[PDB]
A paper describes a structure:
Here we present cryo-electron microscopy structures of human [name] bound to a nucleosome containing human LIN28B or [name] DNA sequences, both of which bear multiple binding sites for [name]. Our structural and biochemistry data reveal that binding of [name] induces changes to the nucleosome structure, repositions the nucleosomal DNA and facilitates cooperative binding of additional [name] and of SOX2 to their internal binding sites. [name] has two DNA-binding domains: [name]-POUS and [name]-POUHD.
The initial cryo-EM reconstructions of the [name] nucleosome in complex with [name] showed a density near the linker DNA, similar to the density of [name] bound to LIN28B DNA. Our structural and MNase sequencing data revealed that, despite the presence of multiple [name] motifs in the [name] DNA, [name] predominantly binds to one binding site in the linker DNA, near the nucleosome entry–exit site (mOBS1), a position overall similar to that in the LIN28B nucleosome structure. Both DNA-binding domains of [name] engage the [name] nucleosome; whereas [name]-POUHD is bound close to the nucleosome dyad, [name]-POUS is located distally from the nucleosome. Nevertheless, despite its distal position relative to the [name] nucleosome, [name]-POUS interacts with the [name] tail via a smaller acidic patch of [name] formed by the side chains of helices 4 and 5. Of note, the H3 tail from the entry–exit site opposite to the [name]-binding side interacts with [name], in contrast to the LIN28B nucleosome. [name] interaction with the H3 tail in the [name] nucleosome prompted us to test whether H3K27 modifications also modulate histone cooperativity on this human sequence, as it does for the LIN28B sequence. We found that both H3K27ac and H3K27me3 modifications increased binding of the second and especially the third [name].
Numbering used by the authors:
A (entry chain G), H (entry chain C): 11 to 118
B (entry chain A): 38 to 134
C (entry chain B): 22 to 102
D (entry chain X): 140 to 220, 238 to 288
E (entry chain H), I (entry chain D): 29 to 122
F (entry chain E): 38 to 133
G (entry chain F): 21 to 101
The structure:
DNA sequence: GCATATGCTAATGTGTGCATGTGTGTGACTATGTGCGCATGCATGTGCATGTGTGTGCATATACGTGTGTGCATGCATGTGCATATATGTGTGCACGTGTGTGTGCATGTGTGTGTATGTGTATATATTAACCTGTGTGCATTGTGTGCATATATTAGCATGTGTGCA
DNA sequence: TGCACACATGCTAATATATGCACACAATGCACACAGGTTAATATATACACATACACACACATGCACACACACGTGCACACATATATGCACATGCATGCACACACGTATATGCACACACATGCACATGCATGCGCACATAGTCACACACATGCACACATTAGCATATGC
């Protein structure tokens, strides 16, 4: 045989193409799975993970932290309009809420 | 003696509790509440420690989101104090009725 | 385990309202909030226990709660699902 | 200027209408009271018809009388349908020209006079004593 | 036994966008929860898309349509580009 | 001439339209609106007649349910007249 | 098709929808707000329906495409297949 | 061999047990489908159909109508507490709404 | 071609509860949508239940649990009784 | 005796100054934030190893391109008449301001129930192994189901009556 | 109480929609035969419940008063109800393109089975970012004090009514 190359490396991805293919096969989604379907899905999952991690890392850097905690993920998701829509019915544990006081409640 | 005017320290608590992420209900009384409610479904029920924590995290998130909606109803009625009818309206609009 | 709903104390409900941005709270909120939380917990725990029966287990796991919450449109992150 | 002679002509005609209508000056004051609410005494009407009142007062009572003479012509039937106190107060003077309200209340209770009456009389006493 | 998760792949992505930033175990669990959630949504929508069209296989075309249905405006456009670029690069190298 | 008090004819219309089931938006203007919105996604699209009917059934049901929620918000503010802020609050609470 | 067809949703038509919703009194600014809300709702449904149509390689939007789009948004509709 | 009789008659049902099995098998739900699963599912579908139809037939009779129309289905569902919960996010075409006027709007 | 629907089976159910009541074509379409919607909800929940428990078979036990999760309280109790009775009769007869 | 003219002085009024009240611009008081120093436990890197993804042919069936015929959606043209738009008058609901009671927030003192750590016994969730019953697969017989047509019912459209509510 | 307006009701024709029927056919059932998923019994490690202990921070109750909510009243213009002219939606047909669906041959691609490495997860330290707490700067509160603006009241001028004097 030739040297075994992972499909993720072939597609230039960090997420596991082979695992996604197996999960699609055993997830009872269809009786057949195309060759490019796990590659496309793994790339999309990797892109979305990078979007959140980049925003959460910026939030962690703002609070003078070197480690991302659930609070930074919550700040990243809720301050991003498109991520907030995607995760609008999702609760993040230990994430808290966004600081928001209605202007009518502020003293005059 | 020094006395803060009404609503001054209430606003301080809003800023304090919107900055933090810890659970606001005491863990032990909430665990007793969870087990009491589960008695009506089964007897001799055991709970994983993370199962009760998951229930508390969802419960507090649900209540905080409800209070945000309740606050908007009170402000809509030109008030600053939430009332039971504000909660009832928010749940009715949400479909939780 | 009798009358544990009063374990959700007045200061605990006030802290939850503060995180929600509430500045002033009427005295009748606390009993109304306890009834709301009681209804919410019954719905989640009933489904979570139902998942436990199907698995033939006697221990409610974190996944059972997560699946119960997901079924109600209240997906929770950070507990294995 | 000519307001003087215009008032005088109005007053002469006013006397003529009053005499023609068969109304006494006290009756004129009563009619003014029941048609405006500011009842005037017959001395004011006398000093008017004789042109004794001051110029500002002259102008002030011109409009009321104008309205009465211009209105009453229609129908008439429905429209028709002490020295010892003085001496005591003078005795109270020559010793304390300007008493306090604390003493004023005692003075009022002593001589049975109203507080406002005694206060205004005290003020006018001071006024006429400061004239000279 | 072995419990598979996405933690090691999430960590690799984190080092790409933030080489000096770590992640807590609780935050890693949330990221693992997020990946499984999005996977189930896309795969579920793609599964229905094949059923609506009387198809028995899920292909990259079904994944592309599911991504557009499930993702908001700019997220869908960029995710489609990453998915298309990976598929194009994949078949170029077999 | 006979004249009804303000709100008397409105109450009759509420009873009239809460009893019937027909579509309350004119069909042809709604069809033109659907095609104009769809032209922003694809050019030269065609619609089945029942496809537009399904859109109108869902659109009117969505609007009627929103007005019911909007009416509750107006009554909550001790009013009887619905206002744009009533709609905004109802959509905010719904999650829109 | 045409342009500016949102005005085709007339004030009497919006009033009838409010009557079915039990609304007694309507402010004059409601009609413009209602038109914006309807356009946002239709844009979301039609965009998904066309996406279903595009995947099927069709040029005609069918009732099923609208039904699937409505189901996708949590607004399942009965009576069209 | 023997005279073929449907599994619906075996289970005493009117809904098609055999068709539910095929819909389960080809619906991509699991690798295998048990024998009792389509029977159980068909009976539940038949019971729910009977519950709505008997309530809708009562609504039609209340309106002096012999034919069930979408209005009668909507009246049956919305007037039943449990069926309204089951179909809470469901829109019935040509069903209308329940007659409901807030008491504050009624004449004084 | 042939289009498959539940119309004939809904009609037989109607003739038992209301022997002298008909149904309109629009109302029959709604009933067909209702049956398909409930079928997909139950089958989807049963499918997830098998995956959660590392099972590859949908059995009546998965269907019964899915019914309890999806139907409201008293509706679920009668539905479970109907399903159990049919499976018992089906097994007793074959 | 009543009705006018006088002398004369209570009473107000112009005009005003103080006194009181309200609003705005800051000492003391409190609480959040910012480094600084230090231990903890939790994240991270390092190896076993094993299970899973991969490379390889292999056979199989789905999907796809091609052509086909047909429904059907689009566009047009015509007609009535229903609904829409405009304007007019007006009632009444919205909003504004006022005031008042009391409910709620703030702060204090006290104790008690929570949180943390510790340990233990027990129930139990988990994994292994054998076997067997159930589901799949295959092919054949065939009966039920959907399509396409008749058929007749219920539904819908008018016209006088019959309340039934509103409104002055 | 009576009038005017709107919805309803028994009533008759009309029709289009539902109901029932007959036929092919595709899907269901029947009968094997196979095999693997599932069950069951066992053992094992897990982690949950139970008890015990401590210290202390939070919860509870009280007292105080501030200001928010609720009722009240006012006025105004906004929106309802109405009438009238009219635009246009609805229905109705007619024609044609044209897209959708069926049907089919068939290659491309996916599953299958198997050997085999290697990537991933569990376990193992390890050190380092987070938490914890002390002191100190620092933004904020508000309360307090001061200054300004505004009414009665009174300093003196006007005003108007009383008692008695004249007069018709």
């Amino acid at each position: 045989r030739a040297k075994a190359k992972t499909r993720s490396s072939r597609a230039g991805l960090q997420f596991p193409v082979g695992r996604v293919h197996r999960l699609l096969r055993k997830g009872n989604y269809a009786e057949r799975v195309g060759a490019g379907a796990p590659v496309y899905l793994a790339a999309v999952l990797e892109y979305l993970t990078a979007e959140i991690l980049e925003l959460a890392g910026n939030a962690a850097r703002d609070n003078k932290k070197t480690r991302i905690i659930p609070r930074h993920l919550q700040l990243a998701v809720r301050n991003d309009e498109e991520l907030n829509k995607l995760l609008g019915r999702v609760t993040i544990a230990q994430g808290g809420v966004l600081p928001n006081i209605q202007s009518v409640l502020l003293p005059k | 003696p020094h006395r803060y005017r009404p609503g001054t320290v209430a606003l301080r608590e809003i800023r304090r509790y919107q900055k933090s992420t810890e659970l606001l209900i005491r863990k032990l009384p909430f665990q007793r509440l969870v087990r009491e409610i589960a008695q009506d479904f089964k007897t001799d029920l055991r709970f994983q420690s993370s199962a009760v924590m998951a229930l508390q995290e969802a419960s507090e998130a649900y209540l905080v989101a409800l209070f945000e909606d309740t606050n908007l109803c009170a402000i809509h009625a030109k008030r600053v104090t939430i009332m039971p009818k504000d909660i009832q309206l928010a749940r009715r609009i949400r479909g939780e009725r | 385990l009798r009358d544990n709903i009063q374990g959700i104390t007045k200061p605990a409900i006030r802290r939850l309202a503060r995180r929600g941005g509430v500045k002033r709270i009427s005295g009748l909120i606390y009993e109304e909030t306890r009834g709301v939380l009681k209804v919410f917990l019954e719905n989640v725990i009933r489904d979570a226990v139902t998942y436990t029966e199907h698995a033939k287990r006697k221990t409610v796991t974190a996944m059972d709660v997560v699946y119960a919450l997901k079924r109600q449109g209240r997906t929770l992150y950070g507990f294995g699902g | 200027k000519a307001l003087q002679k215009e008032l005088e002509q109005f007053a002469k005609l006013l006397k003529q209408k009053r005499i023609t209508l068969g109304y006494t000056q006290a009756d004129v004051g009563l009619t003014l009271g029941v048609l405006f609410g500011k009842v005037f005494s017959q001395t004011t009407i006398c000093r008017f018809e004789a042109l004794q009142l001051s110029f500002k007062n002259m102008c002030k009572l011109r409009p009321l009388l104008q309205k009465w003479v211009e209105e009453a012509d229609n129908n008439e039937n429905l429209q028709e349908i002490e020295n010892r106190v003085r001496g005591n107060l003078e005795n109270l003077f020559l010793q304390c020209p300007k008493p306090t309200l604390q003493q004023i209340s005692h003075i009022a209770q002593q001589l049975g006079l109203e507080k406002d009456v005694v206060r205004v009389w005290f003020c006018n006493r001071r006024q006429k004593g400061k004239r000279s | 036994t072995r419990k598979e998760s996405y933690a090691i792949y999430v960590y690799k992505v984190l080092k790409q966008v933030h080489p000096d930033t770590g992640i807590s175990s609780k935050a890693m669990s949330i990221m693992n929860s997020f990946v499984n959630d999005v996977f189930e949504r896309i795969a579920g929508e793609a599964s229905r898309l094949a059923h609506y069209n009387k198809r028995s296989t899920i292909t990259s075309r079904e994944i592309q349509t599911a991504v557009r249905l499930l993702l908001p405006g700019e997220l869908a456009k960029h995710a489609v580009s990453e998915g298309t670029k990976a598929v194009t690069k994949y078949t170029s190298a077999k």
